[PDB]
C-alpha cells in the first residue's frame, strides 16, 4: 500500500498505480553538493531501489510477462557509479595520507 508493512514488502513497488513516471539519474555535479552522510544514505536508497527493480524483473519474467520501464535499472546503476566516483574524488584531494587511505578503504570495501 502506501507504506511497506514489513521488510518483505520493501521488495515490491508499493507506489505503482495513469502511467507512473520516473525521473532521471543523479548527476555528478549534483552529488558534489552532498555530504558523506547524505551520499551514503542515497547509496542505500539506490541499493534498495535496485533490489526492488531486479526482484520485479525476476518475478515478471518467471511468469513470462514483460518487465515495464526497463531503463530504471541503468539509471540507478549509473547514479551509484557516480556516487562512488565523487567519494573517490574527495578521497584523492584529502591532504592527510592516513585520512585519504581510510576514505579510499571506506569507499572500496566489500
Amino acid at each position: 500500500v502506501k507504506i511497506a508493512k514489513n521488510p518483505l514488502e520493501e521488495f515490491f513497488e508499493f507506489d505503482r498505480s495513469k502511467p507512473v513516471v520516473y525521473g532521471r539519474g543523479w548527476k555528478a555535479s549534483e552529488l558534489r553538493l552532498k555530504s558523506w552522510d547524505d551520499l551514503q544514505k542515497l547509496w542505500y536508497v539506490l541499493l534498495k531501489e535496485k533490489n526492488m527493480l531486479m526482484t520485479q524483473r525476476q518475478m515478471l519474467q518467471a511468469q513470462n510477462m514483460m518487465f515495464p520501464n526497463p531503463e530504471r535499472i541503468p539509471k540507478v546503476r549509473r547514479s551509484m557509479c557516480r556516487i562512488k566516483h565523487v567519494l573517490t574524488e574527495r578521497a584523492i584531494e584529502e591532504p592527510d595520507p592516513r585520512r585519504s587511505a581510510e576514505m579510499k578503504r571506506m569507499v572500496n570495501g566489500m
Binding site: 543523479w26 553538493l33 558523506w36
Partner: protein
C-alpha cells in the same frame, strides 16, 4: 539484397525539418518536409511522399487492414530547396563572423543565401513530464548543498 558496399554518410547536409524536393524516382519533382532521417541506411523519409501499402494482420493489440505509409528515400534523391529561387540546390559550408558553421546555397544559378537550420530540431520528441513521480526528488532538494570543502562541512566519520 543490400548488395552494394555503401559507406555511411558521416556529416549530413540534409536535416530533419528541411524543405526539400525529390529529384529522383517515382515521386520526382515533388516537394516536402523531412519527417525523419534514417542514418544507418543513408535514407530519409519525406512526409506524405514515396507511399507504400502494408498488409498488416490484426492481432489482439493492433488493427488489421491495408495501410498507406511513407517509405524511405535515399538521401542523394532529395535536394534542399533554395530559399530565394525555390529550386533544388547544393549545400555549401560558410563560416560566420563568430566562427559557426552554416549552410549556404551552392551552384550556378543560386542566390547563395543561408539555408536556415530547422526550428523543429530544438523541440523534444519525448516531452518532459508535467508531474513528478513518487520516486522523483524535487529540484529544490537536489540543490541543497550539505558539503563544503573549505569549512569541512559534511566530512565522513573518520
Amino acid at each position: 539484397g543490400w548488395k552494394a558496399a555503401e559507406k555511411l554518410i558521416r556529416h549530413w547536409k540534409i536535416l530533419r525539418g528541411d524543405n526539400v524536393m525529390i529529384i529522383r524516382g517515382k515521386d520526382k519533382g515533388e516537394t516536402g518536409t523531412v519527417k525523419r532521417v534514417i542514418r544507418s541506411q543513408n535514407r530519409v523519409i519525406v512526409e506524405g511522399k514515396n507511399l507504400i501499402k502494408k498488409h498488416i494482420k490484426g492481432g489482439p493489440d493492433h488493427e488489421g487492414g491495408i495501410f498507406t505509409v511513407e517509405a524511405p528515400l535515399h538521401a542523394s534523391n532529395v535536394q534542399v530547396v533554395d530559399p530565394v529561387t525555390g529550386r533544388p540546390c547544393k549545400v555549401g559550408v560558410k563560416y560566420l563572423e563568430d566562427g559557426t558553421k552554416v549552410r549556404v546555397a551552392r551552384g550556378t544559378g543560386t542566390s547563395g543565401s543561408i539555408i536556415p537550420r530547422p526550428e523543429i530540431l530544438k523541440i523534444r520528441t519525448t516531452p518532459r513530464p508535467t508531474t513528478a513521480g513518487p520516486k522523483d526528488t524535487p529540484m529544490e532538494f537536489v540543490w541543497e548543498q550539505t558539503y563544503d570543502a573549505k569549512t569541512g562541512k559534511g566530512m565522513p566519520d573518520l
